[PDB]
Write a protein that binds this ligand. Structure first.
Ligand SMILES: *C/C=C(C)/C=C/C=C(C)/C=C/C1=C(C)CCCC1(C)C
Ligand SMILES: CCCCCCCC/C=C\CCCCCCCC(=O)O
Ligand SMILES: CCCCCCCC/C=C\CCCCCCCC(=O)O
Ligand SMILES: CCCCCCCC/C=C\CCCCCCCC(=O)O
Ligand SMILES: CCCCCCCCCCCCCCCCCCCC
Ligand SMILES: CCCCCCCCCCCCCCCCCCCC
Length: 218
């Protein structure tokens, strides 16, 4: 598990870079008025690229620092919400939702870090997990409510974005509780790595697909 975790860290490092530069290269395929989301998606992968280089070295040393992961989450998760809420809102409704979902994500990740840096299985470990779960469900319930009246190609493209978050973000609570299911300290970092790749690269690809539809492409 130890060597597999190191290899996945190094592979995800290059995958985040590949996601960053591919998304920058693909921005020419859509109209200029829909390139902002492609650029923000590349920045998300670019930030994760910077932190996955550190996480890979941190894991290789033997003294792993999950703070590198959580500081990447607390920066990138609100950024990923910026373009999701843009599809359905603008003006005051947008700024409110962006602010509120960003506060919720920060509490979720902060509570998770409080619990993950506690003793595994302790009351603090569970306190962080329960608080993070409740804010997570609040975020997912809000997300499902977004884009209710949409129809056509834009609705299907937005539903793919929504379902990627609704399904792909479940990997994180499973990773957090993997250390108390078995001798699976490294499996937690395996699941965190796979989820970041699926959710960061995958969202960027879907946002790119949303920009193609908005550009009138079939
Ligand atoms: C780019 C990184 C991504 C999208 C981060 C997502 C992280 C969360 C959805 C994780 C939340 C957690 C829980 C729901 C319960 C246990 C603690 C956390 C922080 C792992
Ligand atoms: C805690 C420190 C965070 C460091 C973040 C480092 C991430 C930099 C990586 C490359 C970003 C490139 C993404 C492209 C930016 C948008 C494209 C554009 O503006 O035209
Ligand atoms: C229990 C409720 C917690 C409320 C959290 C409030 C805001 C927390 C903000 C984000 C913290 C996550 C980032 C911390 C990791 C860095 C630590 C380190 O590098 O040593
Ligand atoms: C373990 C890995 C489980 C990954 C689950 C991924 C969930 C994908 C949700 C939907 C993605 C929709 C893609 C649109 C395709 C057109
Ligand atoms: C360290 C503390 C981080 C607190 C949250 C910072 C969010 C930055 C990204 C905001 C994007 C636009 C809403
Ligand atoms: C382990 C493989 C998981 C693949 C998930 C892909 C989700 C995004 C698809 C975009 C097209």
């Amino acid at each position: 598990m130890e060597e597999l975790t190191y290899r996945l860290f190094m592979v995800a490092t290059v995958g985040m870079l590949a996601g960053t530069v591919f998304l920058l290269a693909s921005s020419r395929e859509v109209k200029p008025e829909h390139r902002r989301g492609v650029y923000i998606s590349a920045l998300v992968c670019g930030i994760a690229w910077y932190h996955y280089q550190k996480m890979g070295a941190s894991w290789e040393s033997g003294s792993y620092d999950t703070g590198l992961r959580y500081v990447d989450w607390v920066l990138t998760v609100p950024l990923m919400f910026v373009e999701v809420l843009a599809v359905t809102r603008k003006g005051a409704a947008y700024n409110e939702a962006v602010r509120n979902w960003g506060i919720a994500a920060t509490v979720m990740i902060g509570a998770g870090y409080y619990g993950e840096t506690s003793a595994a299985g302790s009351n603090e470990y569970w306190t962080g997990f329960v608080i993070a779960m409740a804010t997570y469900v609040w975020l997912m319930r809000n997300l499902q409510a977004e884009g209710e009246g949409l129809k056509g190609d834009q609705a299907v493209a937005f539903e793919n974005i929504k379902n990627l978050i609704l399904v792909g973000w479940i990997i994180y609570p499973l990773g957090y509780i993997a250390p108390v299911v078995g001798d699976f300290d490294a499996i937690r970092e395996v699941l965190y790595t796979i989820a970041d790749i699926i959710n960061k690269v995958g969202l960027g690809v879907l946002v790119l697909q949303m920009a193609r539809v908005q550009s009138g492409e079939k």
